[PDB]
């Protein structure tokens, strides 16, 4: 489907249990390297395969283009299509990831779309997913159920009435990090072209899920996704799935902390 870069992976041969699709801009190589060295590192988690790919568009900068070409050659984990990679094109980026799952990895049990300034606890997420007994039409994250479009015209998330004309958004989950069963990717890709476009990707996915009659659900009886960020502690971070507002150096320090304290107890 018009992909400039495709990861060197074969989901038919080895169906992944969890696929992470990470959004980042071209210049954010430090982010991607920190992820590749921490929670993005591919491995078996309780015998389940984890795969990690980075979603990129294109840029006018020839230097950044060359950097990303070299990075894809070195790492083989970039999914790319020809669209200007800017904040207000994040919907295209998300749909690219979903398209990739649909076309090349329909075997994935679960897919997480996530920001790059994130800590992800794949071990705890896997444990909760294996416990949920939800393998189809499943979508979770930080649920946002009573959202009103932001009409402050200079706000980062401003939408005009022509861009989104109704008083409330559909139910959706924070774009910082949400998780869905793999079949959901095909259903969303199928309905996407008939659903009204909006430049905020997490709202757009919510519109698609609503058209599909897919209901959002909480992953666990306790909160596990934290778009607002969290005060760090080892014992807390062992029992969450996702935390936002984490720069690369911090991500590396937190990962080291969890390694250093492996084998201690907590509650
Ligand atoms: C994190 C997230 O999921 N973002 C989505 C966003 O969610 C925000 C929305 O629910 C609003 C509703 O009032 O509340 C939260 O946002 C807070 C403030 O209301 C918001 O104004 C602020 O945003 C920026 C702020 O305007 C600036 O002055 C400040 O300098 O920087 C702020 C961030 O850059 O942020 C806080 C918390 O983030 C929710 O976070 O909803 C939109 C759609 O409206 C979209 O789906 C986002 O993906
Ligand atoms: C997810 O399911 C497990 C297993 O329960 C069995 O399989 C399910 C698909 C469903 O058909 C159940 O009725 C089956 O009994 C649940 O874990 C078990 O739950 C029972 C009752 O609480 C308990 O006796 C077992 O020891 C549990 N552990 C096992 C079987 O390993 C689990 O509760 C289900 N998850 C949720 C969120 O309900
Ligand atoms: C999102 O990406 C699309 C595709 O790259 C952009 O649309 C193109 O914009 C360039 C100029 O930036 C035009 O020359 C092309 O004709 C457009 N092509 C298509 C297919 O749209 C779009 O501008 C980007 N969005 C934002 C907000 O930057
Ligand atoms: O041109 C862009 C801008 C942002 N992003 C990614 O989109 C997500 C949201 O951006 P950011 O974290 O800057 O927004 P915030 O969390 O501050 O609202 C992050 O993973 C960015 O790396 C991207 O892929 N391309
Ligand atoms: Mn972010």
Residue numbers in the entry: 42 to 308
Sentences from the study reporting this entry:
Human β1,3-galactosyltransferase 5 (β3GalT5) is a key enzyme involved in the synthesis of glycans on glycoproteins and glycolipids that are associated with various important biological functions, especially tumor malignancy and cancer progression, and has been considered as a promising target for development of anticancer agents. The catalytic domain adopts a mixed α/β Rossmann-like fold commonly observed in the GT-A glycosyltransferases superfamily and consists of a seven-stranded β sheet core (β1, β2, β3, β4, β5, β6, and β7) surrounded primarily by α helices (α1, α2, α3, α4, α5, α6, and α7), a two-strand antiparallel β sheet (β5′ and β7’),23 and an additional 13-residue α helix (α8) at the C terminus. Based on the structures obtained from our experiments, β3GalT5 catalyzes the transfer of galactose from UDP-Gal to a broad spectrum of glycan acceptors with an SN2-like mechanism; however, in the absence of a glycan acceptor, UDP-Gal is slowly converted to UDP and two other products, one is galactose through an SN2-like mechanism with water as an acceptor and the other is an oxocarbenium-like product, presumably through an SN1-like mechanisms. While β3GalT5 selectively binds to UDP-Gal as the donor substrate, it exhibits broader selectivity for acceptor substrates.
In total, we obtained eight structures, including β3GalT5 in complex with UDP-Gal, Gb4 glycan, GlcNac-β1,3-Gal, GlcNAc-β1,3-GalNAc, and Man-β1,6-Man. All structures belong to the P1 21 1 space group, with each asymmetric unit containing two protein molecules. Using disaccharides as substrates and measuring the end point UDP concentration after 1 h reaction time, we have selected Man-β1,6-Man and GlcNAc-β1,3-GalNAc-α-Thr in addition to Gb4 glycan and GlcNAc-β1,3-Gal-OMe for further structural studies of the enzyme–substrate complex obtained from β3GalT5 cocrystallized with UDP-Gal and soaked with various acceptors. The acceptor binding moiety has relatively fewer interactions in comparison to the donor binding moiety, resulting in a wider tolerance to different acceptors. The indole lid is turned off when no receptor is bound but is activated by forming a stacking interaction with the nonreducing end of acceptor.
